Structure formats: C-alpha cells, structure tokens
Design a binder for this molecule. Structure first.
Ligand SMILES: *[C@@H]1O[C@H](CO)[C@@H](O[C@@H]2O[C@H](CO)[C@@H](O)[C@H](O)[C@H]2NC(C)=O)[C@H](O)[C@H]1NC(C)=O
Ligand SMILES: *[C@@H]1O[C@H](CO)[C@@H](O[C@@H]2O[C@H](CO)[C@@H](O)[C@H](O)[C@H]2NC(C)=O)[C@H](O)[C@H]1NC(C)=O
Ligand SMILES: *[C@@H]1O[C@H](CO)[C@@H](O)[C@H](O)[C@H]1NC(C)=O
Ligand SMILES: *[C@@H]1O[C@H](CO)[C@@H](O)[C@H](O)[C@H]1NC(C)=O
Lengths: 165, 165
C-alpha cells in the first residue's frame, strides 16, 4: 500500500537481531574489519604536551552475518541505510588517544547495509569523520629542521584476534 | 471532547511512521533539501589554528512523503509543530568542521510540518542556530591588509546523490 518497502525490509531484517552481541553465526572464524583512513587536516602539532590533533575520514567495512535478506522478496532492493544505534558496531579504538569522550572525536550517524544473500549476511559500511588527539613522541634534536613520525595504533580493546580481525 | 485536534493529528500521521528510515515512498527520485544560511556574527578568526568561528542561522526544508494528512479531516488545520527527535532529519554535515560534538554547534529543538495532501507528504521546515568551527586556509601575505576567503562545504556524510539532493 502506502508503506515504503524499506520499512518492511528494516522490520524484517531487524526482527530477531540483537545489537548487544557479536553477529557471528559461523563458529570458527573471526569478523574481518577493514579500516581505511583519509587525512584531511593537521589541526595542531602540540610539542609541549606530546599530542597531535588530526582530522581524519574513517571508513569501516565488515560483514554482519545476521542482517541478510533476499533482494527479490523486498522489491529488488539491495541496499538500505540504517543508524549506528540499531546495529552492532566493532569497538575500534585508537590506543594512544588522549581523549576518552567519543562524542568529541567521532560523528557516527548512519550505516549502509548491502546484502550478500539471505543467510550470507550483509556488508556494513561505516563512514564517519574523526578528530584524533594522538600521543606521539617528538624528537626535537634538529629543531627547527626536524621531521617527526606519528603512530596511530588501532584495534579492539576487548575483542581479541579470535573475535575481531 | 477536551482533547485538542493537534493531539489527534500527531497521533494519526505518526502512527506507522519510522524515523530511522528515509521517508521516500516514491522510488526513482532523491529527497531535495533546501539549505538557507544567514550570517549573524563572526566570533573569532583564529589565525594560529586556521579556524573561523561563525554564528549562523540555518533553515532546512524538504518534503516528508509519509507525514501527510488531509486538513479537512482534522478540523481544517494546515500546520503542526513537532520535535526534531520524532521525525527523520537529513544528516547535513559541515565537511570542514573542527567540532564533532553536535550539541556544541547546533540547537535542534523543533520542526514545522505543513501538509501538501494526504498521500503527497508534508513540507518540513527546520530552523536552528549554529556555531561553526570552520577549517579555512589563511593567506597572510598582505598582513595586515589581507583579505581571506572561507569555504563552507555542506552535504550528507552517508547519503549520496541518489538519496538526498
Ligand atoms: C575473513 O578473513 C579470512 C582470512 O583469514 C577468510 O578466510 C579465507 O576463506 C576463504 C574461503 O572463503 C579461503 O579460500 C581462504 O584461504 C581463507 N583465508 C585464509 C588465510 O585461510 C574469511 O573468509 C574472511 N571472512 C569471514 C571469516 O567471514
Ligand atoms: C526534486 O527535484 C527534482 C529536480 O531534479 C524535481 O524533478 C522535477 O519534477 C517536475 C515534476 O514535478 C518536472 O517538471 C521537472 O522537469 C523535474 N526536474 C528535472 C530537473 O527533471 C522533483 O520534482 C523534486 N521533488 C521531489 C523529487 O520530490
Ligand atoms: C527489479 O525488480 C523488479 C520488480 O521487483 C523487476 O521487474 C526487475 O526485473 C528487477 N530487475 C532485475 C535486473 O531483475
Ligand atoms: C476551516 O474549517 C472550519 C471548521 O472545519 C470551517 O468552519 C472553515 O470554514 C474552514 N475554512 C475554510 C476556508 O474552508
């Protein structure tokens, strides 16, 4: 009738879904997460406090083995946009971050769900802008002709290699 | 009886509505969003950190194809004032923003709904004040007789041209 097909799609795929648990139907394999980074700006290289302020564009892709639907049933449709609140998100952490509030370093709004099949899951694309307060060591021996290398360690804080890769 | 007609109006249009999904009943056309901007103040042109602090008035108009009602049924009322939490809002993002917390750069409080018909949708007006921390490059070659141009890039972070225009 007047109800959109995406309403039925989201009601169907997010029916028995539990966002508080890792969507790993298969037992013997971790969830592969593909993190991609773009540098947009270097806001501040703060020598006195060993912190660098970066403005990055982070893209995060994995496969959610529970949010899979058949495109033929739901009117040919192969994509749907949901909210980051409604699905399980990997806890990608910047290990050397100097900011503990994730509302000042991340702008998670929406996720994109592309189906691979009913029982095969769906690709989840997570695009969000970040502001990283990075703890980097400065070797100011050749100041002001110095070059500095800044490391960004990314990983899951609570999930090990057997759960999230 | 003693119940207002706007109570019956908001209960009827917001009955099967889902605010987590784009209100696009029609298939082959994006949602047109009309962003209008007013400059109210230039708080700070911070040369050392390449950021300009603006105080703007943003007005956002689109058509919500699901929130349409027949005025004649609901005592011939053509408008209703709702909250931004209750309806779907486009993710209008300032691309070069230096602030990721949207509670320090935006004051979304209410929305205005004007009906175009039962099955034709409703015009949504979103008025809110903003404080923009803008990443702008300064060419201080003619200081202090210098003129600077500051760019403000606006768009959806996750929705492409086929969804939001
Ligand atoms: C996650 O990554 C692993 C790689 O460690 C993938 O395992 C591969 O699976 C294919 C079959 O689909 C095999 O042909 C490859 O040999 C496997 N790789 C290795 C290194 O053994 C896995 O498929 C990926 N996806 C998951 C687990 O959903
Ligand atoms: C959104 O904007 C598009 C313009 O791209 C509108 O499409 C127009 O539709 C009218 C009919 O209502 C046609 O007469 C015009 O020729 C169309 N424009 C173009 C450029 O083809 C569309 O109606 C707008 N509103 C929506 C999609 O709800
Ligand atoms: C898309 O779906 C419609 C109806 O569901 C169908 O008519 C059309 O053939 C589909 N497209 C393809 C390429 O199969
Ligand atoms: C608006 O509705 C009221 C009550 O239903 C009616 O008395 C009035 O005539 C209507 N106005 C117009 C212009 O039809």
């Amino acid at each position: 009738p007047d109800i959109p097909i995406q309403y039925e799609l989201a009601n169907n795929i997010m029916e028995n879904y539990q966002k508080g648990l890792i969507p790993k139907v298969r037992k013997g394999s971790p969830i592969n997460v593909t993190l991609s980074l773009q540098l947009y700006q270097i806001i501040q290289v703060n020598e006195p406090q060993q912190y660098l302020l970066l403005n990055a564009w982070a893209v995060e892709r994995w496969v959610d083995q529970m949010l899979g639907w058949d495109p033929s049933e739901f009117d040919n449709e192969t994509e749907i946009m949901a909210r980051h609140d409604d699905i399980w998100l990997p806890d990608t952490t910047l290990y050397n971050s100097l900011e503990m509030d994730d509302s000042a370093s991340k702008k998670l709004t929406h996720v994109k769900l592309t189906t691979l099949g009913k029982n095969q899951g769906a690709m989840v694309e997570l695009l969000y802008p970040t502001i990283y307060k990075i703890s980097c060591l400065l070797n100011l021996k050749y100041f002001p002709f110095d070059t500095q290398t800044c490391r960004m360690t990314f990983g899951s804080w609570s999930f090990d290699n057997s759960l999230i890769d």
